[PDB]
């Protein structure tokens, strides 16, 4: 870790000019943008002042977007190799030479120094040996840029960087042209610069232009990853502390909520509603450790004074003694879940469904905790002092979680509330979450009247298979969390499929008269059983499908947007609370138990149907799926299909590469936009044939007289805006 380290921890506004010629055609152009090092995102709008570039824009992409590469985002293992924030408060200076494949070179000198509050860049360019009827200078480079990668070597000699690289530029006619790059980076002011080990970044690009202008100018838009040396593979510092702190709160509040859990009843929900909105508004204000420990701090603050209502005389003051009690439980526990869920869900970036199945894990375990050391509790020292008992067990582990958790720190988002509550996907998503809820409320009462009226037993068996569903939940939460994780497009069919279940289990409980099926102990039991299991097979993936979704749609990542869909989490579990036992007591009153479930699980199943149908009607991604791959004697035939997912094969070109065992990717063919034009390589020419099919959205690649140097796995590659690759297929010929 360094100083300059603490410089980037922000938005950098950034400038860049160059001034170069090519040929003795001079231009000089100027841009401004933003940086941000958080996240590895850049952003410029670059316009030119001398008029007409002779040299296409994707030639500069490289010097300009490439110029700043101080905002690459490092992993934990790899700020010890981090360079660029190491000289940048006085400046460096980088070197590149560019050799374009059959057509001359680039030379730039440039100069990345830290005036005032700004960013600048100063870059000057020299280019030799130029063919008029070139890809450069005959303007024949497409106007788009593809992914890659830079790999970065250190030089003691000089104690700075060396670099190397490719960029295969697309060209109009169907094929590519080569870009080999060799820079060499340098300190100027003699800081302490870290002299790194090989490593190597990843680099996501994206080229736009602004409509309202009517210069010529460029929108660049860059991602940047860090790696090439893996991890230890075990934990940091921060991680294992927000699980002990997040496992001792979670085990805490729920043995809380085990020991002791109509106008104050709805009114709750009413609340808690609005408490979870507003912390979800505004949370970056307050902050996640703040309201951590505050949430804890009320929380064990109604649990002591709730064994105070003994010794509060009947009256107003009794009312609005546990008025407050109630609205502070709630306030207490919205504040405190959606600061635990966002906090987790910003510790843990990739495994998110795991951590959040584990503390389920945990919550249960807690829970079964509860009868021998309660009981005791109870006849060991009373009534009154259990609660206070537990009061002074939780206001003692407070403090550790003041000590323990780290401070994150966050700005103001750009979108608000509205705009991520009417994405109809979101939408789906809460009308799912308040069928479970609803149908959770509405086997809350009526189990205990069913098992009283029918079986003639009192409400310790009720209690105990409350037990066994809850035990049912807690095995079932973190493998199918775990599942959700490892595997993306198995995560929505999860959602399904554990509303269709539940829908299931309800019909299953109320036995039809219709369907001629009778009641009896253990079929109930272990129904509710399963019940629980479909319960905890759907509610863990839907926290990682609303994120997903959220930066689907376009949301900046940050602590604004895990802050938004926590609370909106906590608001749909609320207001399910809410409209479950109502419409259940209602149900039961009006015409019974029998119909109620019937009615509930019919809600529930008409839920994953609309939800099933949304998925079945709206979607579309883009996919390369291929096939073709065999074993074929030398001089014999194949054809090889690729088949899209998600665009029109007439409007975008298609490329195909391939790629030996112990070698490098090599360019094969391409075949352009309007279907007359075809590109090859002379390893090829002749015997390749390249074919597109717009009916049925293919693209095909046949070949004959084969010889044993075409023993490859070959791609297909398209950019739609970014770079999307397929899995390749072998194809080996003896
Ligand atoms: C009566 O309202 C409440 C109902 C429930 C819970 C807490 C309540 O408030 C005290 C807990 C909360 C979560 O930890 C767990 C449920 C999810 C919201 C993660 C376990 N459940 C049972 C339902």
Redesign the pocket.
């Given at each position: 870790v360094s100083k300059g380290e603490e410089l980037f921890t922000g938005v950098v506004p950034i400038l860049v000019e160059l001034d170069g010629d090519v040929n003795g055609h001079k231009f000089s152009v100027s841009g401004e943008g933003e940086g941000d090092a958080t996240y590895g995102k850049l952003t410029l709008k670059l316009i030119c002042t001398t008029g007409k570039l002779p040299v296409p824009w994707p030639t500069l992409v490289t010097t300009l977007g490439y110029g700043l590469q101080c905002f690459a985002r490092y992993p934990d293992h790899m700020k010890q190799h981090d360079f660029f924030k190491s000289a940048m408060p006085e400046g460096y200076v980088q070197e590149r030479t560019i050799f374009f494949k059959d057509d001359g070179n680039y030379k730039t000198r440039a100069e990345v120094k830290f005036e005032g509050d700004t960013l600048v860049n100063r870059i000057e360019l020299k280019g030799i040996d130029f063919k008029e009827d070139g890809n450069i200078l005959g303007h024949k480079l497409e106007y788009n840029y593809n992914s890659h990668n830079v790999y970065i070597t250190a030089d003691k000699q000089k104690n700075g960087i060396k670099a190397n690289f490719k960029i295969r530029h697309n060209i109009e006619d169907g094929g590519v042209q080569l870009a080999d790059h060799y820079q060499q980076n340098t300190p100027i002011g003699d800081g302490p610069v870290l002299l790194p080990d090989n490593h190597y970044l990843s680099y996501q690009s994206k080229l736009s232009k602004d409509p309202n202008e009517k210069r010529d100018h460029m929108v660049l838009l860059e991602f940047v990853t860090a790696a090439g040396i893996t991890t230890p593979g075990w934990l940091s510092r921060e991680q294992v502390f927000v699980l002990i702190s997040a496992a001792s709160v979670?085990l805490g509040?729920?043995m809380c909520?085990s020991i002791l859990?109509g106008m104050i009843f709805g009114c709750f929900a009413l609340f808690e509603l609005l408490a979870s909105l507003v912390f979800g508004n505004y949370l970056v204000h307050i902050g996640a450790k703040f309201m951590f420990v505050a949430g804890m701090f009320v929380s064990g603050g109604v649990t002591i004074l709730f064994g105070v209502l003994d010794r509060v005389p009947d009256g107003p003051v009794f009312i609005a003694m546990c008025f407050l009690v109630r609205v502070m439980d709630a306030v207490s526990?919205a504040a405190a879940m959606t600061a635990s869920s966002s906090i987790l869900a910003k510790a843990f970036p990739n495994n998110v469904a795991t951590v959040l199945g584990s503390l389920?894990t945990f919550?249960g375990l807690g829970l079964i905790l509860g009868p021998p050391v309660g009981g005791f509790l109870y006849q060991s020292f009373g009534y009154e002092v259990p609660f206070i008992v537990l009061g002074c067990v939780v206001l003692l582990m407070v403090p550790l979680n003041m000590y323990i958790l780290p401070n994150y720190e966050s700005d103001p988002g750009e979108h608000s509330f509205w705009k991520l509550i009417a994405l109809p996907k979101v939408g789906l998503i809460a009308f799912v979450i308040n069928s479970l809820s609803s149908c959770?409320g509405f086997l809350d009462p009526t189990l205990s009247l069913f098992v009283l009226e029918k079986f003639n037993l009192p409400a310790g068996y009720v209690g105990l298979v409350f037990l066994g569903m809850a035990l049912s939940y807690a095995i079932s939460s973190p493998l199918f969390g775990l599942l959700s994780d490892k595997r993306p497009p198995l995560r929505k069919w999860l959602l399904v499929f554990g509303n269709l279940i539940t829908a299931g289990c309800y019909m299953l409980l109320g036995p039809v008269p219709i369907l001629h099926i009778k009641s009896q102990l253990w079929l109930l039991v272990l129904i509710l059983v399963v019940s629980g299991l479909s319960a905890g097979m759907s509610?863990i993936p839907t926290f990682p499908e609303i994120l997903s979704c959220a930066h689907e749609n376009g949301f900046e990542e940050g602590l604004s947007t895990l802050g938004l869909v926590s609370g909106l989490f906590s608001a749909m579990?609320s207001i399910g609370?809410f409209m479950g036992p109502t419409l259940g007591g209602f149900l039961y009153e009006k015409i019974g138990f029998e119909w109620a479930a019937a009615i509930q699980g019919l809600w529930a199943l008409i839920s994953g149907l609309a939800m099933g149908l949304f998925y079945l009607l709206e979607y579309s991604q883009v996919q390369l799926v291929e096939s073709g791959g065999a074993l074929v004697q030398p001089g014999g035939s194949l054809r090889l299909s690729c088949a899209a997912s998600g665009f029109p094969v007439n409007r975008y070109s298609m490329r195909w590469y391939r790629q030996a065992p112990g070698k490098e990717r090599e360019w094969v063919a391409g075949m352009s936009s309007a279907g007359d034009r075809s590109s090859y390589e002379d390893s090829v020419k002749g015997r390749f044939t390249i074919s597109r099919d717009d009916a049925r959205n293919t693209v095909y690649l046949q070949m004959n007289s084969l010889k044993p140097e075409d023993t490859a796995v070959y791609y297909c590659n398209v950019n739609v805006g970014f770079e999307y690759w397929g899995q390749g297929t072998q194809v080996t010929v003896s």
């Open positions: 979670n509040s729920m909520y859990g526990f389920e919550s959770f509610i579990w609370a």
